[PDB]
Short mmCIF file of C-alpha atoms (C1' of nucleotides) in Angstrom, two decimals:
data_model
loop_
_atom_site.label_atom_id
_atom_site.label_comp_id
_atom_site.label_asym_id
_atom_site.label_seq_id
_atom_site.Cartn_x
_atom_site.Cartn_y
_atom_site.Cartn_z
CA UNK A 1 0.00 0.00 0.00
CA UNK A 2 3.08 2.18 0.13
CA UNK A 3 4.11 1.24 -3.41
CA UNK A 4 0.54 0.91 -4.67
CA UNK A 5 0.14 4.55 -3.65
CA UNK A 6 2.98 5.63 -5.93
CA UNK A 7 1.89 3.97 -9.17
CA UNK A 8 -1.52 5.62 -9.05
CA UNK A 9 0.06 9.07 -8.85
CA UNK A 10 2.62 8.07 -11.42
CA UNK A 11 0.18 6.59 -13.93
CA UNK A 12 -2.18 9.52 -13.45
CA UNK A 13 0.50 11.83 -14.83
CA UNK A 14 0.82 9.45 -17.80
CA UNK A 15 4.41 8.37 -17.04
CA UNK A 16 4.12 5.24 -19.18
CA UNK A 17 7.19 3.07 -19.96
CA UNK A 18 10.19 2.52 -17.76
CA UNK A 19 12.55 5.39 -18.73
CA UNK A 20 10.43 7.82 -16.70
CA UNK A 21 9.26 5.22 -14.21
CA UNK A 22 10.91 4.66 -10.86
CA UNK A 23 11.16 1.00 -11.85
CA UNK A 24 14.04 2.20 -14.06
CA UNK A 25 16.21 2.71 -10.98
CA UNK A 26 16.90 -1.02 -11.00
CA UNK A 27 17.26 -2.75 -14.41
CA UNK A 28 20.01 -5.00 -12.98
CA UNK A 29 17.74 -6.48 -10.34
CA UNK A 30 15.44 -9.48 -10.60
CA UNK A 31 14.73 -10.88 -7.12
CA UNK A 32 11.66 -9.44 -5.41
CA UNK A 33 11.16 -9.12 -1.68
CA UNK A 34 7.82 -10.76 -0.93
CA UNK A 35 6.51 -9.58 2.41
CA UNK A 36 3.62 -10.01 4.82
CA UNK A 37 3.12 -13.62 3.67
CA UNK A 38 0.89 -15.86 5.66
CA UNK A 39 2.74 -18.41 7.77
CA UNK A 40 1.62 -21.66 6.11
CA UNK A 41 2.44 -20.70 2.49
CA UNK A 42 5.51 -22.64 1.43
CA UNK A 43 7.95 -22.33 -1.49
CA UNK A 44 5.78 -24.36 -3.87
CA UNK A 45 2.75 -22.22 -3.17
CA UNK A 46 4.68 -18.93 -3.52
CA UNK A 47 5.69 -20.63 -6.76
CA UNK A 48 2.02 -20.69 -7.60
CA UNK A 49 0.98 -17.02 -7.59
CA UNK A 50 4.13 -15.57 -9.06
CA UNK A 51 4.36 -17.39 -12.38
CA UNK A 52 1.39 -15.34 -13.61
CA UNK A 53 3.87 -12.58 -14.35
CA UNK A 54 6.86 -14.59 -15.54
CA UNK A 55 9.07 -17.64 -15.25
CA UNK A 56 10.88 -18.03 -11.91
CA UNK A 57 14.43 -19.28 -12.02
CA UNK A 58 15.11 -19.12 -8.23
CA UNK A 59 13.23 -18.81 -4.96
CA UNK A 60 14.18 -18.46 -1.31
CA UNK A 61 11.76 -18.49 1.62
CA UNK A 62 13.06 -16.99 4.89
CA UNK A 63 12.46 -19.36 7.78
CA UNK A 64 13.89 -19.83 11.27
CA UNK A 65 16.98 -22.06 11.44
CA UNK A 66 15.62 -24.12 14.37
CA UNK A 67 11.87 -24.72 13.99
CA UNK A 68 12.04 -24.29 10.17
CA UNK A 69 8.83 -22.26 9.67
CA UNK A 70 8.11 -19.13 7.64
CA UNK A 71 9.57 -15.85 8.77
CA UNK A 72 7.02 -14.53 6.26
CA UNK A 73 9.27 -13.17 3.50
CA UNK A 74 10.77 -14.56 0.27
CA UNK A 75 13.19 -13.67 -2.54
CA UNK A 76 12.12 -14.83 -6.00
CA UNK A 77 14.13 -14.19 -9.14
CA UNK A 78 12.34 -14.09 -12.47
CA UNK A 79 14.09 -15.25 -15.61
CA UNK A 80 13.24 -12.10 -17.58
CA UNK A 81 13.53 -9.04 -15.34
CA UNK A 82 10.52 -7.12 -16.63
CA UNK A 83 8.37 -9.63 -14.75
CA UNK A 84 9.72 -7.85 -11.68
CA UNK A 85 8.35 -4.53 -12.90
CA UNK A 86 5.16 -6.49 -13.51
CA UNK A 87 4.88 -8.35 -10.21
CA UNK A 88 5.87 -5.50 -7.91
CA UNK A 89 3.49 -3.16 -9.63
CA UNK A 90 0.45 -5.34 -10.34
CA UNK A 91 0.28 -7.86 -7.48
CA UNK A 92 1.28 -5.58 -4.57
CA UNK A 93 -1.50 -5.09 -2.03
CA UNK A 94 -3.22 -8.38 -2.90
CA UNK A 95 -4.85 -10.62 -0.27
CA UNK A 96 -3.74 -14.17 0.46
CA UNK A 97 -4.90 -15.85 3.69
CA UNK A 98 -6.37 -12.63 5.10
CA UNK A 99 -3.24 -10.48 5.00
CA UNK A 100 -2.25 -8.36 1.98
CA UNK A 101 1.28 -9.15 0.85
CA UNK A 102 3.96 -6.59 -0.10
CA UNK A 103 6.39 -6.75 -3.00
CA UNK A 104 9.35 -4.58 -3.80
CA UNK A 105 12.53 -4.65 -5.83
CA UNK A 106 15.51 -5.99 -4.00
CA UNK A 107 19.22 -6.59 -4.35
CA UNK A 108 19.72 -10.07 -2.95
CA UNK A 109 22.90 -11.32 -1.38
CA UNK A 110 23.23 -15.09 -0.82
CA UNK A 111 24.14 -16.38 2.67
CA UNK A 112 26.60 -19.24 3.27
CA UNK A 113 24.36 -20.96 5.84
CA UNK A 114 21.69 -21.76 3.25
CA UNK A 115 24.16 -23.01 0.61
CA UNK A 116 22.60 -26.46 0.29
CA UNK A 117 19.09 -24.97 0.35
CA UNK A 118 20.07 -23.36 -2.96
CA UNK A 119 20.74 -26.58 -4.86
CA UNK A 120 17.82 -28.24 -3.07
CA UNK A 121 15.57 -25.49 -4.40
CA UNK A 122 17.41 -25.11 -7.74
CA UNK A 123 17.17 -28.82 -8.62
CA UNK A 124 13.36 -28.51 -8.63
CA UNK A 125 13.42 -25.26 -10.64
CA UNK A 126 16.26 -26.80 -12.69
CA UNK A 127 13.82 -29.54 -13.79
CA UNK A 128 12.20 -27.06 -16.17
"C1'" A B 1 -68.87 83.74 34.55
"C1'" A B 2 -64.45 79.55 36.85
"C1'" A B 3 -59.75 75.50 37.72
"C1'" A B 4 -57.84 69.98 35.14
"C1'" A B 5 -51.49 71.71 39.14
"C1'" A B 6 -49.41 68.09 33.94
"C1'" A B 7 -48.47 60.59 33.38
"C1'" A B 8 -50.52 56.35 31.51
"C1'" A B 9 -49.76 51.20 28.82
"C1'" A B 10 -50.12 45.03 31.01
"C1'" A B 11 -48.12 40.55 31.98
"C1'" A B 12 -47.82 35.52 30.67
"C1'" C B 13 -48.44 31.66 27.05
"C1'" U B 14 -48.77 30.08 22.37
"C1'" A B 15 -48.42 30.19 17.56
"C1'" G B 16 -48.42 33.25 13.38
"C1'" A B 17 -46.65 38.74 10.29
"C1'" U B 18 -42.41 41.74 9.03
"C1'" A B 19 -38.23 44.90 9.41
"C1'" C B 20 -33.14 44.86 11.12
"C1'" U B 21 -27.96 44.55 13.35
"C1'" A B 22 -22.71 42.64 13.66
"C1'" A B 23 -16.82 45.91 7.02
"C1'" C B 24 -20.15 38.71 10.67
"C1'" A B 25 -19.10 34.46 6.92
"C1'" C B 26 -18.97 32.72 1.52
"C1'" A B 27 -13.77 29.38 -2.92
"C1'" U B 28 -9.91 29.15 -1.71
"C1'" U B 29 -7.33 25.64 1.25
"C1'" U B 30 -1.83 21.47 0.30
"C1'" A B 31 6.18 21.41 0.57
"C1'" A B 32 9.15 20.44 6.97
"C1'" U B 33 6.41 17.74 10.54
"C1'" U B 34 1.41 13.58 14.59
"C1'" U B 35 -5.62 9.75 13.15
"C1'" U B 36 -0.71 7.22 10.40
"C1'" U B 37 -3.23 2.82 15.21
"C1'" U B 38 -1.74 -4.37 15.05
"C1'" U B 39 -0.87 -9.81 17.75
"C1'" U B 40 7.87 -6.80 17.42
"C1'" U B 41 9.46 -9.47 13.31
"C1'" G B 42 12.79 -7.47 6.20
"C1'" U B 43 18.21 -11.09 4.90
"C1'" U B 44 27.06 -10.35 4.98
#
RNA sequence: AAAAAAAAAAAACUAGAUACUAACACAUUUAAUUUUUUUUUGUU
């Protein structure tokens, strides 16, 4: 609802196409921070809603090291960037499980401690 | 024929009739800043 507020102003002025859009600030970014998730949505189900706008190559769900349950945020890289422009913009503020999730562009830095979780995820997304 | 040493209207209630006052106020108002509220939970 922070970002959703921008695009309405932006569009209203007829900004139209990325050169003048704030989405142009990125261009080298693909991963999207996916916030305010419900707790029971897992990687496969976050890999349901987000293929509407593109083809995901990677995904990471943030979850506590001990109990292994959702922190409530994920990082999902689309194959073709412009999906990011599309997902952030179009799907932000949308309800799943009662709570309206947040998306925004992100620069994502991998962490050693999950290293195996990368191949374990990749191998499934490497199937396609 | 005379001198008459100067004061009367109401009030209340309820409705109705009509003037009027106060340079009263009348389209601007939005670039620092508080309605910005949630069971904390956004990662070298």
